[PDB]
Amino acid sequence: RPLVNIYNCSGVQVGDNNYLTMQQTTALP
Amino acid sequence: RPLVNIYNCSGVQVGDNNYLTMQQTTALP
Amino acid sequence: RPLVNIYNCSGVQVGDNNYLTMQQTTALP
Amino acid sequence: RPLVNIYNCSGVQVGDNNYLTMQQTTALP
Amino acid sequence: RPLVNIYNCSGVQVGDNNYLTMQQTTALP
């Protein structure tokens, strides 16, 4: 089976039969 | 089998049986 | 098999059994 | 086999059993 | 085999078993 490497993330969801909105803002100084 | 490398992401969704929405805003100075 | 490297992204969807939409806004200086 | 390197992107869709759309907006000053 | 390097793009679609559309809007100064 294939492997998925995840390093930085807000969270990991597997088997989501529902829904969840996600927002991310990236800004630099 | 293929390998997937994810470094930076808002989140990782595997096995999405529903709709999923994501918003991302990038701003630079 | 081919390898896919993802560095920066809003999110990664693997095994999408439904529709998925993403919005990305980039503000340049 | 070919290799695909993705640095910056709105998102990456692998294994789309449905349809996926993305909106990208670039603003300039 | 050819190599594909994507630095910046609207999105990346791999394994399109249906259709994919994207909207790109660029605001000019």
Shortest distance, CA D11 to any CA of chain E (angstroms): 5
- What DSSP element (H or E) covers D8? strand D4-8
Asked if D11 reaches chain B (Cβ–Cβ under 8 Å), the answer is yes
Structure tokens that stand for D28 in this block: 């300039």
- What DSSP element (H or E) covers D4? strand D4-8
Structure tokens that stand for A20 in this block: 């969840």
CA distance C28 to B23: 17
Structure tokens that stand for B10 in this block: 């808002």
Sequence-distant (6+) residues with CB within 8 A of C19 are: B19, D18, D19, D20, D21
What is the radius of gyration, based on Cα positions, of chain A?
13
Q: C20 by DSSP, 3-state: which? A: strand
CA distance A14 to B16: 7
List the single residue in A with minimal CA-CA distance to C2: A2
Q: Are B15 and A18 in contact (CB under 8 A)?
A: no
Residue from C8, A4, A25 nearest B7 by CA: C8
- Cβ neighbours around A22 below 10 Å, total: 19
| D7/C11 touch (CB, cutoff 8 Å), yes or no | no
CA distance B13 to A11: 9
Sequence-distant (6+) residues with CB within 8 A of A4 are: B3, B4, B6, B12, B14, C12, C14
